[PDB]
Nucleic acid binder design. Structure first.
Ligand SMILES: [Zn+2]
Lengths: 118, 205, 28, 23, 146, 157, 80, 140
RNA sequence: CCCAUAGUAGGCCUAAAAGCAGCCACCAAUUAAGAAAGCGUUCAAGCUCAACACCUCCCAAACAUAUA
């Protein structure tokens, strides 16, 4: 599900991925949104690739990492998985996803006036 | 004569001995002419600097423009340019003495009042062109009344009595707490850390 | 340009506290 | 009386006029 | 609340007025945040608190109607902005990149093409500094700039 | 570099650490404090004297006119001994409860002007108001009896 | 716009919405600009009749309404 | 539209006080000085007389008039043809109380001039108030 | 947000300069609008304000939530 990443803040529109094809005038800065529309693997892939220790074990380590943008994982990889790791961010639920007793337990804080329009 | 009198470029009697630029005439709190004397409004210096002749013409010109002489009078507090600032000739090599006297200058330290105002005028009337004047000055300045002056001095007492910080500059510097007079000036025991160079830190307790 | 972190402030502060107690025990 | 507070209003209007010169 | 029923006929019908819960734990507070011990203890996550101050088409309610503090009205106004953009208020429409903690409007921010040197680096704003004084239960405070 | 410079000179690093350690800390209370709890008597004597003066009173919404048109209304009611009074309802709402006018407390709000009188030319005032298709007659009170506009037709007739 | 029959009951409990509407825009100020319209105001839950000359009949019971909704809705039917 | 002038009855159609200042709404100054000469005849001649004139959008003339002015009324009644210049300390005409009361009886009368005060002190306070702002001393 | 009549086109100088080309007084009417604080006109007429009535190519990767 690496199409469904979530940058915090305006990092989708501010964070810039710069590469250079070695040709002159071939400097290519591309924001995180545009690069996520090109390939929905490369943001998590560049993040991991920057985290790893800058040595020669790094690309063998990148060939151990298997990135898929959807719920679909191939069957030869599904027959290898052992543990599913917990997500590091607790996804806050929205107002459709609160149950009724969760809404009812939270108080109404303030009396609206009887004649106000909304 | 309720206007700013003409401030000359250099006094009639010259100063034939050249002077060393003793830049501690900019540094620190001013002693002379900090309070009002038959004034109500002024241009207080929140920092030190040098006034040229052209600054004095900016104040005399742009004040006597927008001024009611039947309602308002005004007095110079800072004297005429008396410090001879020299410059060597343009594009000539070092040595060969000290350069010839180029132009005269007054030193104005921080907390100095420059131009007193007075008369049948409220502060909000005189905020405008004294803020324009206070922004054309070389140092950071401010148009200050009498009650605004005692207002911000009482504010500085409130800052010095309210802070929950146990460590002030006065307790550290004068007691030589962290061996820290190796890094401090000898003036920092009397400026008490509110002056760095010619500048002034009003926000710093 | 070099700036002051929280490590440096806490370290500086605990040296100030050792210093204040040195001031106390030299006072009698 | 009436002209007392009318006088006070006219001095307040003069005050606002003398403040609104530079604006 | 009241509604404006129309069809040409236009009438106004006061319909189904709510009320606040009968026991504020801090009576003789001032804001309804201040009355309920919530001065620093809400964020954009909790939408049961934010939704009570929101017009049903997503906008804020004015400070006179809600009776909020000035401070808490800017805080709720900012948290409601930060919660519409995280998709937490889906039913406050008039009629896709996942975000959260967005200070500025997403269609208004130029990208950082030259992030500065290490001593002058242009950072990315995350969250709002109106939410500084919240209770952080970590030791490091909220990093507002990434 | 000199001790006085034109730019703010870089401090030594322990100078700067002292400046950061000795910053100002403002006090924080446990509860924020903001989250804790002549002409007027001229109008009272003047309009209170108008209360005892009039036997009959009327009122309208006299904001809907021009200046010379209010001069025409001022002269055509100057033709009578009726008086017209533009005064704030802000003080008039305690005026009514002072004068024991409980049926007149729901009367005086918005733009209004008094038509205090002892002699009714109010039928002829209606004759002036029928040529202008606005500015209705708001209810009065002759001698602690309320006049609806139907009662202005009956009494004025 | 051709006619407005503005109506309220101040002998009964007052409504300042249609009365404020009567003051600011059912005055001669808009009629100093808008000459064809003909207000008439009676006086006795309030009611505002609007006679469009062309094709409509706009009647508003503005007891619980407010003056801005009545005015901007009125002008929404003026733009039509 | 509304036009208010101070055109004297001594000269009916002068020119620059009536030519270009009327030449925007569209006028016929021959009728204006004709009817203005009717207003010259109906009252004492050789005096400034203000107008009311309301130029209709149907282009007709309605000249309404009241009393004379306050300038040549007081200064001519004090016998001053060209008045004082300072008017704070300089005086030429010393006019008694009863003279001001005698002209004030024929003063609070007009509609277009709107000096419509029911008492007398409400008008003599106004024109004694103009007598302080001019070079006339209020005797007694 | 409104809201603006009247002594008056304040006197003198000025072709007239009217609150607004300058000097001086700057009183006054209603309940209340300054002999006027900004546009504006040769001058005017018109617009607002105070006050009344509602009130060479960027350069660690990153990350706001777990107890110091
Ligand atoms: Zn509160």
């Amino acid at each position: 599900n690496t199409r469904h990443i979530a940058f915090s803040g305006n990092k989708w529109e501010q964070k810039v991925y710069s590469s250079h094809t070695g040709y002159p005038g071939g400097f290519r800065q591309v924001t995180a949104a545009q690069l996520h529309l090109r390939d929905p693997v490369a943001i998590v892939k560049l993040a991991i690739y920057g985290m790893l220790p800058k040595n020669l074990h790094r690309r063998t380590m990148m060939e151990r990492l298997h990135l898929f943008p959807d719920e679909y994982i191939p069957e030869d990889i599904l027959k290898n998985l052992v543990e599913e790791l917990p997500q590091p961010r607790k996804i806050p639920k929205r107002l459709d996803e609160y149950t009724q007793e969760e809404i009812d337990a939270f108080p109404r804080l303030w009396t609206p006036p009887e004649d106000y329009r909304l | 004569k309720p206007k700013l009198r003409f401030i000359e470029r250099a006094p009639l009697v010259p100063k034939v001995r050249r002077e060393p630029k003793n830049l501690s005439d900019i540094r620190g709190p001013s002693t002379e002419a900090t309070e009002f004397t038959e004034g109500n409004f002024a241009i207080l210096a929140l920092g030190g600097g040098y006034l040229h002749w052209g600054h004095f013409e900016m104040m005399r010109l742009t004040i006597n423009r927008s001024m009611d002489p039947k309602n308002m009078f005004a007095i110079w507090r800072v004297p005429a340019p008396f410090k001879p600032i020299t410059r060597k000739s343009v594009g000539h090599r070092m040595g060969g003495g000290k350069g010839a006297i180029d132009h005269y200058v007054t030193p104005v330290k921080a907390g100095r009042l420059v131009v007193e105002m007075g008369g049948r005028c409220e502060f909000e009337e005189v905020q405008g062109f004294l803020d324009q004047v206070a922004h054309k000055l070389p140092f950071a300045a401010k148009a200050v009344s009498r009650g605004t002056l005692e207002k911000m001095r009482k504010d500085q007492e409130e800052r010095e009595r309210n802070n929950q910080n146990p460590w002030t500059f006065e307790r550290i510097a004068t007691a030589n707490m962290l061996g820290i007079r190796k890094v401090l000036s000898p003036y920092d025991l009397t400026h008490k850390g509110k002056y760095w160079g010619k500048f002034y830190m009003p926000k710093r307790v | 340009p070099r700036f002051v972190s929280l490590r440096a402030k806490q370290n500086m502060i605990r040296r100030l506290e050792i210093e204040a107690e040195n001031h106390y025990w030299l006072s009698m | 009386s009436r002209e007392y507070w009318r006088r006070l209003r006219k001095q307040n209007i003069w005050r606002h006029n003398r403040l609104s010169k530079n604006k | 609340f009241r509604e404006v029923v129309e069809t040409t006929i236009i009438e106004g019908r006061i319909t189904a007025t709510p009320k606040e819960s009968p026991n504020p734990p801090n009576p003789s507070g001032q804001c309804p945040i201040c009355r309920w011990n919530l001065k620093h203890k809400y964020n954009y996550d909790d939408v049961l608190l934010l939704s009570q101050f929101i017009r049903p088409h997503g906008g804020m309610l004015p400070r006179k109607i809600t009776g909020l503090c000035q401070e808490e009205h800017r805080k709720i106004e900012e948290c409601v902005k930060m919660a519409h953009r995280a998709g937490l208020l889906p039913n406050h429409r008039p009629r896709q990149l996942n975000r959260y903690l967005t200070r500025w409007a997403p269609g208004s921010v130029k990208p950082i093409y030259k992030k500065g040197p290490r001593w002058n680096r242009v950072r990315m704003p995350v969250g709002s500094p109106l939410l500084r004084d919240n209770v952080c239960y970590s030791r490091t405070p909220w990093k507002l700039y990434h | 570099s000199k001790a006085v410079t034109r730019h703010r000179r870089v401090m030594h690093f322990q100078r700067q650490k002292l400046m950061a350690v000795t910053e100002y800390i403002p006090p924080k209370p446990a509860i924020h404090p903001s989250c804790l709890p002549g002409l007027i008597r001229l109008l009272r004597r003047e309009i209170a004297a108008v209360f005892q003066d009039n036997r009959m009173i009327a009122v309208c919404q006299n904001v809907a006119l021009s200046a010379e048109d209010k001069l025409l209304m001022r002269h055509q009611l100057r033709k009578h001994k009726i008086l017209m009074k533009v005064f704030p309802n802000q003080v008039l709402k305690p005026f009514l409860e002072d004068s024991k006018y409980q049926n007149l407390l729901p009367l005086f709000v918005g733009h209004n002007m008094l038509l205090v009188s002892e002699e009714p030319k109010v039928k002829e005032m209606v004759r002036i108001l029928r040529t202008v298709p606005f500015l209705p007659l708001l209810g009065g009170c002759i001698d602690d009896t309320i006049l609806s506009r139907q009662g202005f037709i009956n009494y004025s007739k | 716009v051709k006619q407005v029959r503005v109506q309220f009951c101040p002998f009964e409990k007052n409504v300042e919405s249609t009365r404020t509407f009567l003051q600011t825009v059912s005055s001669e100020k808009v009629r100093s600009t808008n000459l064809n319209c003909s207000v008439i105001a009676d006086v006795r839950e309030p009611c505002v009749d609007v006679l469009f000359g062309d094709g409509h009949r706009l009647i508003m019971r503005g007891a619980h309404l407010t003056a801005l909704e009545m005015l901007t809705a009125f002008a929404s039917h003026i733009r039509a | 539209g509304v036009i208010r002038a101070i055109v004297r009855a001594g000269l009916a159609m002068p020119g620059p006080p009536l030519g270009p200042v009327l030449g925007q709404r569209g006028v016929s100054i021959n009728q204006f000085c004709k009817e203005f000469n009717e207003r010259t005849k109906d009252i004492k001649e050789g005096i400034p007389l203000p107008t009311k004139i309301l130029v209709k959008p149907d282009r007709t003339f309605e000249i309404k008039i009241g009393q004379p002015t306050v300038s040549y009324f007081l200064k001519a009644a004090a016998g001053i043809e060209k008045g004082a210049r300072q008017t704070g300390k300089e005086v030429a005409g010393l006019v008694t109380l009863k003279h001001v009361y005698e002209i004030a009886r024929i003063k609070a009368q007009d509609e277009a001039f709107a000096l419509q005060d029911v008492p007398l002190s409400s008008v003599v306070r106004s024109i004694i108030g103009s007598a302080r702002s001019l070079g006339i001393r209020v005797v007694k």
